[PDB]
Amino acid sequence: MNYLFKNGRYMNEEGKIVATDLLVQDGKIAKVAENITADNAEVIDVNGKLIAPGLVDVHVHLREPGGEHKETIETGTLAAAKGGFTTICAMPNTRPVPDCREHMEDLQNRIKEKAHVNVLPYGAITVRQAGSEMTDFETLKELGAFAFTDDGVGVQDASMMLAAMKRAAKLNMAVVAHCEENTLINKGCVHEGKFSEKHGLNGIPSVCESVHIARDILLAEAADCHYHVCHVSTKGSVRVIRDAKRAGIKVTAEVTPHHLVLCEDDIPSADPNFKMNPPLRGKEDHEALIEGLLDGTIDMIATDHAPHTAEEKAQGIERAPFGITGFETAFPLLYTNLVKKGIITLEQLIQFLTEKPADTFGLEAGRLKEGRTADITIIDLEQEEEIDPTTFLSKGKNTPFAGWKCQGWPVMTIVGGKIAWQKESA
Amino acid sequence: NYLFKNGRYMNEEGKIVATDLLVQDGKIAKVAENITADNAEVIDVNGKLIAPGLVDVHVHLREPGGEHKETIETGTLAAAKGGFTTICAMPNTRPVPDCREHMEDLQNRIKEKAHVNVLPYGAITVRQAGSEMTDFETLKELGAFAFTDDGVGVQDASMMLAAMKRAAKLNMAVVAHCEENTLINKGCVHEGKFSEKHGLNGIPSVCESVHIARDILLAEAADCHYHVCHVSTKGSVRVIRDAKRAGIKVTAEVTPHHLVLCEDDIPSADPNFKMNPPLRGKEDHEALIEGLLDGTIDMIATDHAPHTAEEKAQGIERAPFGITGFETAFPLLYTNLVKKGIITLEQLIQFLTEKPADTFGLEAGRLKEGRTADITIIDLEQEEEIDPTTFLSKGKNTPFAGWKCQGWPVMTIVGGKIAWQKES
Numbered sequence: 001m002n003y004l005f006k007n008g009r010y011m012n013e014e015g016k017i018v019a020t021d022l023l024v025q026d027g028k029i030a031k032v033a034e035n036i037t038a039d040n041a042e043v044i045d046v047n048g049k050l051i052a053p054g055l056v057d058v059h060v061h062l063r064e065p066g067g068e069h070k071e072t073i074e075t076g077t078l079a080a081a082k083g084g085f086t087t088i089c090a091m092p093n094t095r096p097v098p099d100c101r102e103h104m105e106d107l108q109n110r111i112k113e114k115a116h117v118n119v120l121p122y123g124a125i126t127v128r129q130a131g132s133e134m135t136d137f138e139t140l141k142e143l144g145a146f147a148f149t150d151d152g153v154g155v156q157d158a159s160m161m162l163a164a165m166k167r168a169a170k171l172n173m174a175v176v177a178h179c180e181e182n183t184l185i186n187k188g189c190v191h192e193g194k195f196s197e198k199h200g201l202n203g204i205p206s207v208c209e210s211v212h213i214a215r216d217i218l219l220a221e222a223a224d225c226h227y228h229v230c231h232v233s234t235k236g237s238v239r240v241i242r243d244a245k246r247a248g249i250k251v252t253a254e255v256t257p258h259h260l261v262l263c264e265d266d267i268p269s270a271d272p273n274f275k276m277n278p279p280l281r282g283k284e285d286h287e288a289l290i291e292g293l294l295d296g297t298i299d300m301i302a303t304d305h306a307p308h309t310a311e312e313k314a315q316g317i318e319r320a321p322f323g324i325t326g327f328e329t330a331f332p333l334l335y336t337n338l339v340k341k342g343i344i345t346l347e348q349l350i351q352f353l354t355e356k357p358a359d360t361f362g363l364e365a366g367r368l369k370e371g372r373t374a375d376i377t378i379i380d381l382e383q384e385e386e387i388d389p390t391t392f393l394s395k396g397k398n399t400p401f402a403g404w405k406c407q408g409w410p411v412m413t414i415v416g417g418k419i420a421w422q423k424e425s426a
Numbered sequence: 427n428y429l430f431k432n433g434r435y436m437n438e439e440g441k442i443v444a445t446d447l448l449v450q451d452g453k454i455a456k457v458a459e460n461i462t463a464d465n466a467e468v469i470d471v472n473g474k475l476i477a478p479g480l481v482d483v484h485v486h487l488r489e490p491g492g493e494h495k496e497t498i499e500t501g502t503l504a505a506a507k508g509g510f511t512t513i514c515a516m517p518n519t520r521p522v523p524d525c526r527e528h529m530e531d532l533q534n535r536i537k538e539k540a541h542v543n544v545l546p547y548g549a550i551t552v553r554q555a556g557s558e559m560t561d562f563e564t565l566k567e568l569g570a571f572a573f574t575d576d577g578v579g580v581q582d583a584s585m586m587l588a589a590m591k592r593a594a595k596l597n598m599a600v601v602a603h604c605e606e607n608t609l610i611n612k613g614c615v616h617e618g619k620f621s622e623k624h625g626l627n628g629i630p631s632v633c634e635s636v637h638i639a640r641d642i643l644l645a646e647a648a649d650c651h652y653h654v655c656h657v658s659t660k661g662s663v664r665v666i667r668d669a670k671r672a673g674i675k676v677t678a679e680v681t682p683h684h685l686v687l688c689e690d691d692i693p694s695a696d697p698n699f700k701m702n703p704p705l706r707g708k709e710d711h712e713a714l715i716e717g718l719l720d721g722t723i724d725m726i727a728t729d730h731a732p733h734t735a736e737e738k739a740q741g742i743e744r745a746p747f748g749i750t751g752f753e754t755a756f757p758l759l760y761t762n763l764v765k766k767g768i769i770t771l772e773q774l775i776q777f778l779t780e781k782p783a784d785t786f787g788l789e790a791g792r793l794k795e796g797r798t799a800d801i802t803i804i805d806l807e808q809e810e811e812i813d814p815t816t817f818l819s820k821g822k823n824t825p826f827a828g829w830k831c832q833g834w835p836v837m838t839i840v841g842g843k844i845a846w847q848k849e850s
C-alpha cells in the first residue's frame with residue numbers, strides 16, 4: 001500500500017524548516033513537495049508536526065544474546081522505534097561476542113527474524129574482547145559488520161590497536177574506540193572531582209579517557225585509517241580531537257545526550273541511575289563538550305543505550321553496573337534542554353541524529369530524499385509530557401531523567417513503509 | 427686572574443661585537459672593550475669568539491658500572507674540549523642513583539675527579555625497572571638535577587602520573603625517554619626506506635610519539651614541568667606544538683645528529699649510525715628544523731653515548747645504540763646550520779647556553795659581571811677535519827669522521843681554572 005503525509009513541517013536540503021507534504025510508494029519516498037494529489041493512496045494528516053528522517057543511532061546495546069533479561073532484540077528495536085530511530089548499531093559486548101563466522105551469522109539471523117528497525121552490528125576487534133588476539137576482519141566484513149570495536153573495554157596493547165587500524169584501513173572500514181587506560185581507573189565509580197571528594201568515593205580521573213584518544217589518533221594517522229571516538233566526556237579529549245582535525249587526520253567523535261545535559265554538579269546523591277562510563281564530569285568538561293559540538297569537533301550525537309534491570313541498580317553506587325537507558329529519552333530531552341534553550345537550532349539537532357552519523361560511516365540513511373528507502377518519523381513539538389519509566393517499551397528502566405517535563409516526542413515511526421510504532425492518540 | 431683581550435662575543439642585545447673580559451677570584455669582573463689590569467696574566471685571542479661555557483642537559487658518563495666505555499675523568503675532559511662547562515649525567519648506570527647510598531657515592535666521584543660541573547639526574551623508579559618509585563624528596567636534597575628513567579620508557583601510565591604529581595610539588599622536572607615497548611618491533615633502525623632496503627627490523631615513529639602525547643596530558647593534570655628527550659618524529663613535534671598553544675609546561679630538546687642526519691644519509695649497515703631514537707625520514711628531519719625555528723624545540727643536547735670500538739664492530743642488529751657527541755657538537759652545528767644560514771650565531775649559542783639554563787633554573791650560560799667564570803674560546807675561522815683518533819673521550823663511535831668543520835673550541839675555563847686548551 002501507499003501513504004500520503006499532509007500538512008507537516010520538514011527540514012529542506014538548504015537548511016530551513018518549511019511546510020510540505022510527502023508521498024510514499026512501495027517502501028520508498030516517491031515525492032516531497034507542497035500540495036500533492038494522490039488517489040488510491042491513504043492520507044495521514046499530521047497537524048503541523050515535524051516529518052523527520054528516521055533517526056540514526058551509532059552506539060547501542062541490545063544485550064541479546066547472553067543478557068536477554070536486560071534487553072532483547074525485539075524490545076530494544078521496538079523501544080528504538082518509539083524514540084524515532086529507524087537505524088541502530090548494536091555493540092559487541094555480548095555472550096557470545098561476535099568474533100567469528102559462527103557468532104556473526106547467528107547474530108545476523110536474529111536481526112532478520114525479530115527486529116522492528118534496521119540493525120547494523122559491530123564486529124569485535126579482539127576475540128572475546130580479551131585483547132590478546134585479533135578477529136578475522138575480512139570474514140566479519142563479509143557478514144555485514146558495521147565497524148570494529150571492543151566497546152565495554154579499551155584496547156590496552158598499542159601494537160594491537162595499530163595492527164587493527166592497518167587491517168581496517170585496507171578494507172575501507174572504521175575502528176571505533178571505547179577509550180579507557182586501565183591503570184588510571186583507580187577503582188572509580190564516578191568522576192574524580194567535587195562529588196567524589198564530598199561523598200568520599202574513589203574517582204575516575206579525566207586522563208583515563210584522554211590518553212587513549214591521544215595515543216590512537218597517532219596510530220590512526222600512521223595507518224591512514226578512519227578512527228571514531230566513543231562518547232567523549234573531557235575538555236582535554238575535545239582539544240586533542242580539535243588538534244587532530246586541524247592536521248587533517250581522519251578522526252570523528254560522538255557525544256551522548258546525558259553528557260550534553262548533565263555534569264557532576266547535577267547529581268543529587270549516591271544514585272546508581274547517575275552512574276555511567278564515562279562519568280558525568282566537571283562544569284568545564286561539560287562546557288567544552290557543548291563548544292565542541294558547535295565548532296564541528298564533535299560530529300554527532302549517539303545514545304550509548306545501556307539497559308539494566310532495576311534489581312542490579314537497586315544496590316549501592318559502588319557495586320551497581322555502569323549505564324543508563326537512552327532510546328526513549330533522546331529527542332525530547334535534547335529538544336527541551338538544548339533547542340528550546342537556544343544552545344542549538346532544531347536543524348542542528350536533526351542533523352546530529354540523522355545525516356551527520358550517516359555521512360561519517362557511509363550510509364544511505366537519514367535524509368528525506370526522493371529515491372531513498374522510506375525511513376521516517378513524526379514528532380510532536382507542542383505537547384508537554386513528563387518522562388515516565390513505568391511506560392517504557394524498553395526493559396531497561398535505569399534513567400536519571402524521571403519527572404523531567406519535555407516536549408518533542410515522536411508520535412509515529414516508519415521503517416521502509418511498514419509502520420513499526422505509533423503513540424496512543426493521532 | 428686572566429684578562430682575555432681582543433675577542434668577540436654575543437651581547438645582551440643580539441649582535442656580535444668586540445670586547446675584553448677580566449676574570450678574578452673565579453668570577454667575571456668586567457665585560458667592556460679595552461680593559462687594563464696591571465697584575466693579571468694576559469691572553470690575546472685575536473678576534474675569536476668568547477662564548478659562555480656550553481650547557482648539556484643529556485649526557486652519559488658510564489661510571490659507575492661502565493668504566494670501559496667512559497669514566498667521569500675522561501668524559502668531562504672530553505666535555506671541556508667540546509666547550510661544555512656544565513653537563514647533566516643520566517642515571518642508567520650500575521648501580522642506578524635511585525637512593526641515598528648510590529646518589530652520595532655518585533656525588534663523591536664527581537667531586538673527586540670531574541673536570542667540569544656535573545649535575546646528576548635521579549631515577550624515577552628503582553633500578554629503572556618501573557614498578558617502585560624513588561624517594562624524590564631525598565634525591566632532591568642530595569642534589570638531583572631532575573627525574574628520569576632514561577634508557578627506558580615509563581610503561582605504567584599511573585606511575586608516570588604519580589611521579590609527575592610528586593615532582594610538581596617539589597618544583598622539579600620529569601624528563602622522559604619516550605618509548606612505547608609494544609611498538610619497538612625488535613628494531614635497530616627507523617622503519618622506512620633504509621630498513622626496507624637492507625631487510626632489517628625497524629622502529630616506527632609512533633613508538634616515540636604515543637608516549638609524548640600521553641605524558642603531555644598527564645603533565646597537564648599534575649601541573650608539572652615535563653621535558654621531552656631527543657625529539658625525532660614529525661608527529662612528536664606536532665603534539666608538542668599543540669601542547670604549548672594550550673599553555674602546558676612542556677619543553678623539548680633535539681640532538682646535533684638528528685638535526686644534521688636522516689635515513690637517506692646512512693651509507694650502509696654501519697653501527698656508528700645506530701642510535702635511539704633512530705635517524706628517521708626526510709620529512710621528520712624537516713619538522714625538527716621547523717620546530718627548532720618556531721620555538722617548539724627549546725634546546726640542543728648531545729646525548730653523548732660512548733661505546734667501545736669492539737662493541738660497535740658486532741653488527742647493526744647486536745651493537746648498542748648511541749654515538750659520542752661532546753667533541754663534535756659545536757663544530758657540526760656551526761658548519762651545518764650557521765654557515766648555511768638555517769639559524770644565526772646568536773641562536774646556536776643560546777640553544778647550548780641560556781635556553782637550557784633558563785628552562786631548568788640554573789645560573790649558567792651567560793657572560794655577565796658577577797657570574798662564575800665558565801667560559802669557552804671558539805675559533806670560527808680555522809677549518810679542521812673531525813678525527814676520532816684525537817678524541818679524549820673513550821667513545822670514538824661517531825659517523826662524522828672526515829667531515830671538515832669550522833667553529834672549534836681552543837680553550838675552556840671552569841670557575842677561573844683552565845680545564846683544557848688546544849695543545850698544538
Ligand SMILES: NC(=O)N[C@@H](CC(=O)O)C(=O)O
Nearest residue numbers: 061152276277304306322323
Ligand atoms: N554505557 C555504559 O555506561 N556502560 C557500557 C559499557 C561501557 O561503556 O564500558 C555498558 O554496556 O554497560
Ligand SMILES: NC(=O)N[C@@H](CC(=O)O)C(=O)O
Nearest residue numbers: 486577701702729731747748
Ligand atoms: N641514545 C642512545 O642511542 N643510547 C643511550 C640510551 C638510549 O637512548 O637508549 C645509551 O645510553 O647508550
Ligand SMILES: [Zn+2]
Nearest residue numbers: 151152178230
Ligand atoms: Zn563504552
Ligand SMILES: [Zn+2]
Nearest residue numbers: 091151152304
Ligand atoms: Zn557503550
Ligand SMILES: [Zn+2]
Nearest residue numbers: 576577603702
Ligand atoms: Zn634515551
Ligand SMILES: [Zn+2]
Nearest residue numbers: 516576577729
Ligand atoms: Zn640518552
